[PDB]
Design an enzyme around this catalytic site. Structure first.
Site, PDB file in Angstrom:
ATOM      1  N   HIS A  83       0.861  -1.430   0.058  1.00 19.28           N
ATOM      2  CA  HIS A  83      -0.061  -0.153   0.210  1.00 19.28           C
ATOM      3  C   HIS A  83       0.908   1.302   0.045  1.00 19.28           C
ATOM      4  O   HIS A  83       0.991   2.015   0.834  1.00 19.28           O
ATOM      5  CB  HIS A  83      -1.012   0.183   1.255  1.00 19.28           C
ATOM      6  CG  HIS A  83      -2.032  -0.950   0.965  1.00 19.28           C
ATOM      7  ND1 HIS A  83      -1.819  -2.291   1.780  1.00 19.28           N
ATOM      8  CD2 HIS A  83      -3.052  -1.317   0.155  1.00 19.28           C
ATOM      9  CE1 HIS A  83      -3.053  -3.072   1.433  1.00 19.28           C
ATOM     10  NE2 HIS A  83      -3.660  -2.232   0.628  1.00 19.28           N
ATOM     11  N   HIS A  87       1.553   1.176  -5.969  1.00 17.81           N
ATOM     12  CA  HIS A  87       0.066   0.702  -5.853  1.00 17.81           C
ATOM     13  C   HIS A  87      -0.907   1.863  -6.254  1.00 17.81           C
ATOM     14  O   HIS A  87      -2.032   1.837  -7.149  1.00 17.81           O
ATOM     15  CB  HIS A  87      -0.410   0.111  -4.537  1.00 17.81           C
ATOM     16  CG  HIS A  87      -1.841  -0.127  -4.583  1.00 17.81           C
ATOM     17  ND1 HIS A  87      -2.463  -1.020  -5.422  1.00 17.81           N
ATOM     18  CD2 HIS A  87      -2.700   0.318  -3.525  1.00 17.81           C
ATOM     19  CE1 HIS A  87      -3.713  -1.136  -4.752  1.00 17.81           C
ATOM     20  NE2 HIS A  87      -3.868  -0.288  -3.827  1.00 17.81           N
ATOM     21  N   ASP A 241      -8.538  -1.238  -8.212  1.00 21.59           N
ATOM     22  CA  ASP A 241      -7.836  -1.808  -6.937  1.00 21.59           C
ATOM     23  C   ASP A 241      -7.629  -3.100  -6.709  1.00 21.59           C
ATOM     24  O   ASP A 241      -6.525  -3.594  -6.202  1.00 21.59           O
ATOM     25  CB  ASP A 241      -8.749  -1.345  -5.619  1.00 21.59           C
ATOM     26  CG  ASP A 241      -8.077  -1.116  -4.314  1.00 21.59           C
ATOM     27  OD1 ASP A 241      -6.786  -1.089  -4.298  1.00 21.59           O
ATOM     28  OD2 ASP A 241      -8.657  -1.187  -3.418  1.00 21.59           O
TER      29      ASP A 241
HETATM   30  O1  LIG Z   1      -6.987 -15.412   0.700  1.00 21.70           O
HETATM   31  N1  LIG Z   1      -7.269 -14.295   0.003  1.00 21.70           N
HETATM   32  O2  LIG Z   1      -8.324 -13.924  -0.188  1.00 21.70           O
HETATM   33  C1  LIG Z   1      -5.927 -13.373  -0.370  1.00 21.70           C
HETATM   34  C2  LIG Z   1      -4.948 -14.090   0.322  1.00 21.70           C
HETATM   35  C3  LIG Z   1      -3.757 -12.850   0.136  1.00 21.70           C
HETATM   36  C4  LIG Z   1      -3.686 -11.982  -0.248  1.00 21.70           C
HETATM   37  C5  LIG Z   1      -5.036 -11.542  -0.963  1.00 21.70           C
HETATM   38  C6  LIG Z   1      -5.125 -10.092  -1.688  1.00 21.70           C
HETATM   39  C7  LIG Z   1      -5.876  -9.155  -1.254  1.00 21.70           C
HETATM   40  C8  LIG Z   1      -5.919  -7.884  -1.940  1.00 21.70           C
HETATM   41  C9  LIG Z   1      -6.889  -6.893  -1.387  1.00 21.70           C
HETATM   42  C10 LIG Z   1      -7.022  -6.590   0.226  1.00 21.70           C
HETATM   43  C11 LIG Z   1      -6.074  -5.677   0.817  1.00 21.70           C
HETATM   44  C12 LIG Z   1      -6.024  -5.755   2.415  1.00 21.70           C
HETATM   45  N2  LIG Z   1      -6.930  -6.449   2.943  1.00 21.70           N
HETATM   46  C13 LIG Z   1      -8.054  -7.333   2.304  1.00 21.70           C
HETATM   47  C14 LIG Z   1      -7.973  -7.403   0.785  1.00 21.70           C
HETATM   48  C15 LIG Z   1      -5.126  -7.616  -2.865  1.00 21.70           C
HETATM   49  C16 LIG Z   1      -4.062  -8.730  -3.516  1.00 21.70           C
HETATM   50  C17 LIG Z   1      -3.404  -8.461  -4.291  1.00 21.70           C
HETATM   51  C18 LIG Z   1      -2.440  -9.260  -4.960  1.00 21.70           C
HETATM   52  C19 LIG Z   1      -2.353 -10.684  -4.326  1.00 21.70           C
HETATM   53  N3  LIG Z   1      -3.290 -10.810  -3.308  1.00 21.70           N
HETATM   54  C20 LIG Z   1      -3.861  -9.753  -2.611  1.00 21.70           C
HETATM   55  C21 LIG Z   1      -6.103 -12.453  -0.707  1.00 21.70           C
HETATM   56 MG   LIG Z   2      -7.444   0.628   0.686  1.00 23.73          MG
HETATM   57 ZN   LIG Z   3      -5.743   0.316  -2.960  1.00 29.64          ZN
END
Ligand SMILES: O=[N+]([O-])c1cccc(-c2cc(Cc3ccncc3)cc3cccnc23)c1
Ligand SMILES: [Mg+2]
Ligand SMILES: [Zn+2]
Length: 335
Positions: A83, A87, A241
């Protein structure tokens, strides 16, 4: 050394050539970050504003724009792996591409376009690299100010607008009060919808919209009221996003490495504090590949599938890439 006088430096030329792909899905955004001296958000925002003639349309002085952009970029944290300003630049550029989808031609006003791009630029500013829940559980001042409700996303907005007040930073100085009130409401509505807790409802409403979908000869979408227009803009920036898995694999994996780095760091902090380790933040118990397949199947593919419908057939290749990347991670689950 020979002073340069009115001609681009060779790096600046190499940068200018990379920025020729600003209208393409899959821009070499990390190359641009390096070539710009870690100013991807500034250089990409500036290119997009010139491309779309937003400086002339909104009477934004060029020095004010650059000062604001630099200031905004300076408030993304260099130490945060995902972040950060790269990004931000990526979501700006991805939104910029989505805005020019054939199905959306002539749909949005210049002010609406400005709102989506500015919203994208500010949407994660001053992100500390930890989640809302971490901020809530530690009784942080931020969480106290925002009553534990969309803590970071409220903060991103507050900071993005607040920075307009720094010296020569008010890029909206020449907008009328009506223009500013409208822009402001749109930007707020867009950034607050990036809270992941709002995803399901946001998707639900996008589906409902696709059902009642209306177009006009040529097949360009029709959007009459503020409610429909803002819904599309919210989901547009939300797709940007969540666009990493739809990019070429080389880019997607870089984003994956970074978010895992950021998550594992939060988990290390949770562990050392004796807190429960947040989902996906435990480096001793990770399944990176399983998790990406899950991310795609339950969140990213459902969203993008619904977007591809809204703008059919504009997003077909993006969706194809997503499905190829899903298969690649699936085949990499060590079993
Ligand atoms: O198991 N998964 O769903 C899972 C596991 C590991 C990574 C993610 C993931 C979440 C988010 C968006 C986000 C950011 C912060 N908090 C929540 C969602 C963005 C990502 C971008 C690239 C790779 N993984 C991502 C999802
Ligand atoms: Mg955000
Ligand atoms: Zn973002």
């Amino acid at each position: 050394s020979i002073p340069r006088f009115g001609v681009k430096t060779e790096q600046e030329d190499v940068l200018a050539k990379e920025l020729e792909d600003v209208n393409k899905w899959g821009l070499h955004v990390f190359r641009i970050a390096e070539l710009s001296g870690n100013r991807p958000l500034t250089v990409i925002m500036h290119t997009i504003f010139q491309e779309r003639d937003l400086l002339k349309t909104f009477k934004i002085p060029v020095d004010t724009l650059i000062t604001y952009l630099m200031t905004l970029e300076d408030h993304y944290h260099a130490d945060v792996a995902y972040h950060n300003n790269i990004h931000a630049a990526d979501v700006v550029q991805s939104t910029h591409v989505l805005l020019s989808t054939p199905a959306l031609e002539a749909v949005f006003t210049d002010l609406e376009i400005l709102a989506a791009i500015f919203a994208s630029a500010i949407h994660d500013v001053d992100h500390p690299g930890v989640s809302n829940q971490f901020l809530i559980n530690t009784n942080s001042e931020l969480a106290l100010m925002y009553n534990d409700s969309s803590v970071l996303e409220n903060h991103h907005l507050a900071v993005g607008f607040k920075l307009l007040q720094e010296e020569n930073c008010d890029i909206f100085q020449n907008l009328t009060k009506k223009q500013r009130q409208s822009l402001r409401k749109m930007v707020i509505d867009i950034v607050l919808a990036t809270d992941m807790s709002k995803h399901m409802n946001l998707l639900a409403d996008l589906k409902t919209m696709v059902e009642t979908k209306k177009v006009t000869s040529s097949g360009v979408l029709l959007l009459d009221n503020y409610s429909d227009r803002i819904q599309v803009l919210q989901n547009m920036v939300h797709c940007a996003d969540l666009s990493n898995p739809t990019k070429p694999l080389q880019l997607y994996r870089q984003w994956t490495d970074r978010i895992m780095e950021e998550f594992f760091r939060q988990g290390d902090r949770e562990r050392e504090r004796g807190m429960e380790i947040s989902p996906m933040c435990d480096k001793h118990n990770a399944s990176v590949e399983k998790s990406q397949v899950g991310f795609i199947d339950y969140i990213v593919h459902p969203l993008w599938e619904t977007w591809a419908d809204l703008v059919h057939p504009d997003a077909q290749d993006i969706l194809d890439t997503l499905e190829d990347n899903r298969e690649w991670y699936q085949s990499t689950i060590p079993q």
